[PDB]
Nucleic acid binder design. Sequence first.
RNA 1: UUUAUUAAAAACACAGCACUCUGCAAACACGAAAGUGGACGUAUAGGGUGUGAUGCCUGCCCGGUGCUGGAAGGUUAAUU
RNA 2: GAACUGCAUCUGAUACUGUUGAGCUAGAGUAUGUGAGAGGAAGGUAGAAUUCCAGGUGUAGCGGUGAAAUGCGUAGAGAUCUGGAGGAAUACCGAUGGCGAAGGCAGCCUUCUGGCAUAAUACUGACACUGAGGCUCGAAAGCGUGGGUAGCAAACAGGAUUAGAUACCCUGGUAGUCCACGCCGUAAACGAUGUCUACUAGUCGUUGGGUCCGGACUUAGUGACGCAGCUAACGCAAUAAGUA
Lengths: 272, 86, 102, 56
Amino acid sequence: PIVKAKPTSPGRRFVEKVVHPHLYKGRPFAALLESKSKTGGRNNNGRITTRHIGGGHKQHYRIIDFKRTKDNIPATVERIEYDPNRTAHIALLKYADGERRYIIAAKKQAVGDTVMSGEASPIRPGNCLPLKNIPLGTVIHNIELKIGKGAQMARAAGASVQLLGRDGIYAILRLRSGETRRVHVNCRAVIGEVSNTENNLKSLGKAGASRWRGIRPSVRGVAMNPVDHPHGGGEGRNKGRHPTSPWGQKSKGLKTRHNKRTDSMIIRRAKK
Amino acid sequence: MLTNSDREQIIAQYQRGENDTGSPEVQVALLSARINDLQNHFKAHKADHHSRRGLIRMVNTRRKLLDYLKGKDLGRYTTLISQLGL
Amino acid sequence: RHYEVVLLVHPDQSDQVVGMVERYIKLVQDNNGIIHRLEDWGRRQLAYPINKIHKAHYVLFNIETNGETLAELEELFRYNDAIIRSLVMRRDDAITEESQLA
Amino acid sequence: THIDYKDVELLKQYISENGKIVPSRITGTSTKYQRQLATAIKQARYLSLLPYTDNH
RNA sequence: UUUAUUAAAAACACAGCACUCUGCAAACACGAAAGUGGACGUAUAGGGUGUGAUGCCUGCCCGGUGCUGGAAGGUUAAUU
RNA sequence: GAACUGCAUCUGAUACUGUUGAGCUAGAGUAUGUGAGAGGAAGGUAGAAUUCCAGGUGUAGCGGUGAAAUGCGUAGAGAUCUGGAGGAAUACCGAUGGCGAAGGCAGCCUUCUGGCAUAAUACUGACACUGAGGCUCGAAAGCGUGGGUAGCAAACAGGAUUAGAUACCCUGGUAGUCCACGCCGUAAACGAUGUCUACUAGUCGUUGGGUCCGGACUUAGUGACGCAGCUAACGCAAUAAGUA
């Protein structure tokens, strides 16, 4: 849940942290770990290709099994760990044969329960099933887009999808973005909603809390000069121009979707 | 809730005589078990306000009976709340 | 606690209803349950079209079981895809005599 | 005497041609049995033994 | 935090708020492309824009210019 | 002289109050069997209907009003048929009917759960009533955060009516209404009638019981009348506004 901080300091007056006393306080499973260094949002040309990235805490990469190809072999949840690489929690699995893996953790998933993968699996949070073996109306996550590729959609804290139905070899889904989508019925999904449902509910409280996460400050375009931003310029405060990115592209309703090969996989979107 | 099988067991332990079921000790013992049993119902239904008024009533009734014993037989009172943990 | 459950099976899937009933029968009898009545009403003309069909197969069977097994039963009915409707009752007594519908 | 939701033949004469429960001022049934009459019809309607209305 | 070397501030940033884009080969950015970052992330995420703790709040105008949706009609390129 | 109502200290009395010992069951409770109920909380589901989206038929209107107009419609509306999405409420039953301390509570089903009504036996033996402060609960509206959003609809926009019309009427329409968790603590929160006792003509309904022989009686509610009595009058009148 959330826990407000006492206003003992001005920097602590609006710190509202998410606290989970049920998650592992120890260190992650060593063998499922990878070194991972910050990039500062720079590509192989050394250029900033995504701004406001840089800094933060060193963190390992936990190798999450987004594929779940160990079918018909039961695994028990050894422990639920915190993951710095994502917002969701991760369950340490313990397969019958002793092999240990990390998966995204469902909200309704605790330590000790058994998780199954494959086609003949119970409909319980944690199990990974092809979209044809999942009855309509259940809440799922970790949605595959290609067969055998691994989970792509609904992988963030609190993510969930509504399996609306089937119209042949596709499965109609309703994503949290409000977009109705068809996906091949042979793709897999995991039952339940993703844990850490109270993540959006938090409040960092101070500028240094965002610096701890690798985020650098962001300078509004109207705070610039015209040589740096289309919004730059002016004696005093002024916008003067239609809102636009520093590269000259509208940011108040201009739709930017170029794909014409996936255009037939999308039923509709939602207007609100 | 308490069943008949266990309800008769509390009476049989706080008997003041032959099949009395009316003494202050057996009544307070029955209310105490009933009150503790409903603690599980109100942990899952805290918004239940109409049932909780009934729970307060037996809490109030148990207090009245304990006041009566304290005024009637002090030894019968200090011993009874020692067993019931009140 | 006695329970009276009536199932609505799809007419197309009425060929496995005998194997469907015994699956629940064995489930209840396994967990110290007693089947006080069981009858197959047969194909019946529905009063209104359910799921775009006009005829369906009715199965009634009064049972006695615990809460845990009833939860198993309710889950099976919902995920069966052949039971198009179900109605579970709590009966104070045990009913054995044949119902007037059969 | 007693009433159940499986007395569909008996429930027919307590329901009108368009499917509404007949009021007690017409049939004259007791208040106790009308309450049992109403819930039995309501359950029989759910099981599709009796129509909610005469057009569906 | 800032005008290294006349301006340290009411300027910038900031936690928070809103709009909008983006269904993943994501949008977006570097690049001539390959290859990258975004991100071994996945809409509780990522980008852009504005505003700037908090408290009370945030009225009217879609004529203009944008943006989004629609296609009855008018006009309309190469080509033929 | 009387009086100074008083105060003090002794003595006597024991009907009542106080304090105590023992006992009793008639007030109040307990155990056991049946019964009724929109009592409360959590989940699930069903059928109508509205709205929206997509198609088929079809063509010039639809909608609305006291009339109109705004609005929708030749980009194909309205009507009609077939699908899909979604939210909210639960027609009939339905009832001076029921349950709840009040506020309130209606499809159906399961789970958790409160009180009440009822015959008999057993039991405790005055454990009672009321209650300043206090605490709890407490319609609707409203507020906070997070979801949802079909219909209705404050505000708002337009059309009318009018001298004007910041209204009534019309076409739209956002907060709200819905959900979760918290605040708020107020209503003509009314029976304008505090709670608890006992007693006082009667008549006719009705709900849940019970006991007798279709009736009769007895209970606990809920009504319509109507004596005595009360009331300024209205009126109340065993559910008192009568007698205490």
